[PDB]
């Protein structure tokens, strides 16, 4: 019975299991910007682009010219020269605006009077070109999409989850993303969410994470690990060190108000993270010796 | 919507059951280890036709032997029986011999025919199989030398690899389902279960020691064994899968008032398993829905 001993204590509570997981990265199918062709027309220009580039605000991409409107709008044009009640001209401007013509061009046909055709469609938001490439002069009708833009303000990782473990997960703090490529600063998480779709091969649920990406960083199909921390229904837990065995004999020490140490027989359950969880043997309150010293 | 050819499902509160197969090897108890040691300084005889592989059905004859020293004591009692001596002291010397290591059956046999007890033969303690037992002829043996050693076949130990995360979710023997490729059997009945402290460092694994009754004994320690484990889940809303419908964003089924009237009530799923699903927010607990239901618009 030395004196250079530390006193611990049985605490009630649960254990924390960790695990690392295969994370493939993805482009949010939500931060996409599509440009669609409201009317069936023809193309010219195109600009110098490939399928995967950067944009500033969208700015100008490929310009069209269309036949179907000029015929119709012209009748309007002479209707403004010859006698035509206000209501007449509006009807026409209405059938043209409905047929698809941008507002900015109509008001600037009524003001310049000079018939309109070459339209430049300035792309939305910032972002990264996805799809595209279609160029030169092609025949377009009815809204067909000619391009997209992918966002990188939110980014997507998806881990494979075993179903029971997946069911336990109910909070963002247990996740912990790490990435080989960019150690540097860590990578805050904005959202987590499970896709009830139960993979039939691996008994794996899809668990999606959204990622706070400002300065870019992550591309398609990089490499990332996702350590998570599960738990367990609470057990009487003690420091592993304060515990000892060797054979079939396993147990430790009890400290008293009247400081005298009496060995007590206990039976362990699990022991992860450096803390054991006892099946039976001790009571919640009892104190215990951690990293101490005694003499037989 | 008038004729009713339908089944009804009570919605309920409760957990879910996840099945999982696990690798199992078969093993012998370190506990059944029964060694046979010498009761004293003696010498050898016989050594029955036994190899290492052979199974001793019961405790049966391992060998014969004779013992010196021992002898001085037996005959001394023999003069006392003749020349009327202290019955108490004769029993004392017998207790000292029965203390040295003399079987009760042979001392009975001695008073019966009287013939001093010459050589006696030892018989194995436990049923099973010999694991080392080579000595033959007659050699010199002193103290507690292990002459022979045996392995038990009555209980058999099968170990599975467990994930410590899924570990504490075990709780009872009925979840385990034990199956071996070797044979479809009448009794793959497991008696006891327990966990070893050892964790698999590289990949987190507990070693789940199981113990299976093996009277028939047709289980070899090399065999392969598949363990269908079953896990559970914090109680959720429980609906039979057959009656849950979607293949798009639409996420619901039939809601019944019990008034015989059907209605589209929207729900959100959490997960599915083993033939039913659990709903992370959607319907009420007692609400009725319809599996097996069949009709149109
Ligand atoms: Cu127009
Ligand atoms: Cu426990
Ligand atoms: Cu004897
Ligand atoms: Cu749940």
**Cβ of B197 and A163 within 8 Å?**
no
Burial tier of B219 (Cβ tally within 10 Å: 0-12, 13-18, 19+): buried
Of A12, A41, A24, nearest to A137 by C-alpha is A41
Polymer length in residues for chain A:
296
Written as six digits, the tokens of B89 are 């002291």
Residue of A nearest to B279 (CA): A196
Burial tier of B206 (Cβ tally within 10 Å: 0-12, 13-18, 19+): buried
Written as six digits, the tokens of B142 are 């002193």
Q: Enumerate the residues of chain A whose CB falls inside 8 A of the CB of residue B163.
A: 162
Q: Which residues make Cβ contacts (< 8 Å) with residue B143, sequence separation at least 6?
A: B38, B40, B41
C-alpha–C-alpha distance, residues B198 and A68, integer Å: 79
Written as six digits, the tokens of A255 are 């400290």
Q: Enumerate the residues of chain A whose CB falls inside 8 A of the CB of residue B271.
A: 163, 166-167, 194, 196, 198, 205
Interface of B with A (CB under 8 A): 16, 18, 20, 163-169, 195, 197, 199, 204, 206, 231-234, 269-273, 277
Sign of the torsion formed by the C-alpha atoms of B187, B193, B197 and B199: positive
Q: Which residues make Cβ contacts (< 8 Å) with residue A178, sequence separation at least 6?
A: A224, A225, A226, A227
Of A92, A102, A42, nearest to A71 by C-alpha is A92
Q: A76: left (phi > 0), else alpha (psi -120 to 50), else beta?
A: alpha
CA A243 to chain B, closest CA, distance in angstroms equals 13
**Cβ of B165 and A268 within 8 Å?**
no
Written as six digits, the tokens of B18 are 């996840």
Spacing of C-alpha A13 from chain mean position: 32
Method: X-ray
User: For residue B60, how many other CB atoms are within 10 A of its CB?
Assistant: 12
**Cβ of B164 and A233 within 8 Å?**
no
Task: Enumerate the β-bridge partners of residue B228.
Answer: B21, B177
Written as six digits, the tokens of B263 are 């209605």
Q: Are A229 and A14 in contact (CB under 8 A)?
A: no
C-alpha–C-alpha distance, residues B106 and B117, integer Å: 7
Q: Are A46 and A135 in contact (CB under 8 A)?
A: yes
Interrupted after residues, chain A (C–N over 2.5 Å): none
User: For residue B220, how many other CB atoms are within 10 A of its CB?
Assistant: 10
Task: Enumerate the β-bridge partners of residue B128.
Answer: B56
What Å distances lie between residue B140 and B38, B50, B62, B97, B120, CA to CA? 11, 20, 17, 21, 16
Give kind and range of the element (H or E) at residue A198. Answer: strand A189-198
For an interface test with A, which of B20, B164, B166, B232 has the most A Cβ atoms less than 10 Å from its Cβ?
B164
Residues around ligand 4, an ion, CB closer than 5 A = B 236
Spacing of C-alpha B5 from chain mean position: 50
Task: Enumerate the β-bridge partners of residue A42.
Answer: A65, A139
Q: Which residues make Cβ contacts (< 8 Å) with residue B276, sequence separation at least 6?
A: B16, B238, B239, B240, B241
Angle subtended by helix axes B87-100 and B70-82, to nearest 10: 160
Written as six digits, the tokens of A185 are 């600063």
Of A275, A282, A290, nearest to B164 by C-alpha is A275
Which ligand is in closest contact with the Cα of B66? 3
C-alpha–C-alpha distance, residues B248 and B285, integer Å: 25
Q: Are B141 and B45 in contact (CB under 8 A)?
A: no
C-alpha–C-alpha distance, residues B179 and B228, integer Å: 8
Polymer length in residues for chain B:
297
Give kind and range of the element (H or E) at residue A123. Answer: none
C-alpha–C-alpha distance, residues B169 and A162, integer Å: 14
Of B213, B230, B91, nearest to B156 by C-alpha is B213
C-alpha–C-alpha distance, residues B131 and A207, integer Å: 53
Q: Are A148 and A32 in contact (CB under 8 A)?
A: yes
Cα torsion through B85, B88, B89, B95, rounded to 10: 140
Written as six digits, the tokens of A53 are 């580039």
CA B16 to chain A, closest CA, distance in angstroms equals 9
Task: Enumerate the β-bridge partners of residue B150.
Answer: B34, B130
Written as six digits, the tokens of B4 are 């009713």
Resolution (A): 3.8
CA B236 to chain A, closest CA, distance in angstroms equals 10
**Strands A11-13, B34-37: pairing kind:** unpaired
Of B246, B163, B240, B262, nearest to A163 by C-alpha is B163
What Å distances lie between residue B28 and A12, A123, B13, B217, CA to CA? 37, 73, 43, 12
C-alpha–C-alpha distance, residues B253 and B246, integer Å: 8
C-alpha–C-alpha distance, residues A33 and B90, integer Å: 109
C-alpha–C-alpha distance, residues A127 and A58, integer Å: 8
Residue of B nearest to A193 (CA): B270
Query: Cα angle vertex A100, ends A95, A105, to 5°?
Result: 90
Written as six digits, the tokens of B57 are 């059905």
C-alpha–C-alpha distance, residues A61 and B170, integer Å: 62
Sheet holding B120-123, edge to edge: B120-123, B61-66, B42-45, B140-141
Give kind and range of the element (H or E) at residue A90. Answer: helix A86-99
Q: Enumerate the residues of chain A whose CB falls inside 8 A of the CB of residue B235.
A: none
For chain B, how long is the longest CA-to-CA vector?
114
For residue A219, the SS3 value is coil
Q: Are B182 and B224 in contact (CB under 8 A)?
A: yes
Of B152, B156, B134, B187, nearest to B57 by C-alpha is B152
Q: Residue for token digits 């599996």?
A: B291
C-alpha–C-alpha distance, residues A190 and A182, integer Å: 19
Written as six digits, the tokens of A267 are 């039976």
Long-range contacts of A134-138 (CB under 8 A, 24+ apart): A135/A43, A135/A46, A135/A62, A136/A43, A136/A46, A137/A42, A137/A43, A137/A44, A138/A42, A138/A43
Written as six digits, the tokens of B216 are 């028939």
**Strands B61-66, B140-141: pairing kind:** unpaired
What Å distances lie between residue B183 and A3, B176, B227, B229, B254, CA to CA? 62, 18, 14, 19, 46
C-alpha–C-alpha distance, residues B283 and A21, integer Å: 34
Written as six digits, the tokens of B249 are 């964003």
Strand ranges in B113-251 using DSSP code E only, listed in sequence order: 120-123, 128-130, 140-141, 146-151, 155-162, 177-179, 190-193, 196-199, 206-213, 224-231, 236-240
Domains of chain A: residue spans and CATH: 1-13+235-296 (2.40.420.20), 14-31+151-234 (2.40.30.170), 32-65+117-150 (2.40.50.100), 66-116 (6.10.140.730)
What Å distances lie between residue A184 and A156, A178, A179, A217, A222, CA to CA? 19, 10, 9, 11, 16
Q: A134 φ, ψ to 5°?
A: -50, 125
Sign of the torsion formed by the C-alpha atoms of A166, A172, A176 and A180: positive
Written as six digits, the tokens of A47 are 């600009």
Q: Are A21 and A225 in contact (CB under 8 A)?
A: yes
C-alpha–C-alpha distance, residues B272 and A197, integer Å: 8
C-alpha–C-alpha distance, residues A105 and A57, integer Å: 21
C-alpha–C-alpha distance, residues A266 and A251, integer Å: 5
Q: Residue for token digits 């269908």?
A: B228
Written as six digits, the tokens of A178 are 């790490």
Question: Within chain B, where are the H helices?
Answer: 70-82, 87-100, 104-113, 164-167
CA B286 to chain A, closest CA, distance in angstroms equals 23
User: For residue A129, how many other CB atoms are within 10 A of its CB?
Assistant: 20
User: For residue B66, how many other CB atoms are within 10 A of its CB?
Assistant: 15
Q: Enumerate the residues of chain B whose CB falls inside 8 A of the CB of residue A15.
A: 168
C-alpha–C-alpha distance, residues B185 and B215, integer Å: 12
C-alpha–C-alpha distance, residues A211 and A172, integer Å: 12
**Strands A250-252, A244-245: pairing kind:** antiparallel
End-to-end CA distance of chain A: 8
């Amino acid at each position: 019975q030395n004196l250079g001993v530390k006193t611990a204590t049985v605490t009630r509570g649960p254990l924390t299991f960790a695990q690392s997981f295969p994370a493939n990265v993805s482009y949010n199918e939500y931060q996409y910007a599509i440009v669609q062709a409201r009317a069936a027309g023809f193309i010219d220009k195109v600009y110098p682009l490939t399928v995967g580039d950067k944009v500033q605000k969208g700015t100008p991409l490929l310009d069209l010219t269309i036949p179907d409107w000029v015929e119709a709008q012209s009748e309007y044009l002479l209707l403004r020269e010859t006698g035509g009640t206000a209501t007449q001209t509006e009807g026409i401007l209405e059938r043209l605006r409905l047929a698809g013509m941008p507002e900015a061009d109509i008001r600037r046909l009524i003001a310049t009077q000079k018939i309109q055709t070459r339209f430049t469609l300035k792309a939305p938001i910032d972002g990264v070109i996805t799809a595209f490439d279609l160029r030169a002069g092609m025949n377009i009708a009815k809204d067909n999409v000619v391009a997209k833009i992918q966002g990188m303000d939110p980014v997507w990782v998806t881990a494979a989850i075993p179903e029971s473990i997946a069911w336990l997960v109910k909070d963002a703090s247990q996740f912990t993303l790490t990435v080989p490529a960019r150690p540097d600063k860590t990578l805050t998480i904005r959202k987590w969410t499970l896709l009830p779709g139960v993979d039939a091969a691996t008994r794996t649920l899809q668990l999606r994470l959204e990622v706070d990406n400002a300065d870019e960083a992550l591309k398609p199909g990089m490499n990332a690990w996702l350590q998570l921390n599960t738990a367990s229904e609470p057990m009487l837990l003690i420091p592993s060190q304060a515990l000892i065995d060797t054979g079939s004999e396993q147990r430790v020490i009890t400290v008293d108000a009247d400081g005298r140490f009496v060995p007590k027989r206990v039976a362990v359950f699990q022991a992860s993270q450096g803390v054991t969880a006892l099946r039976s043997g001790l009571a919640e309150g009892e104190k215990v010796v951690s990293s101490g010293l005694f003499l037989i």
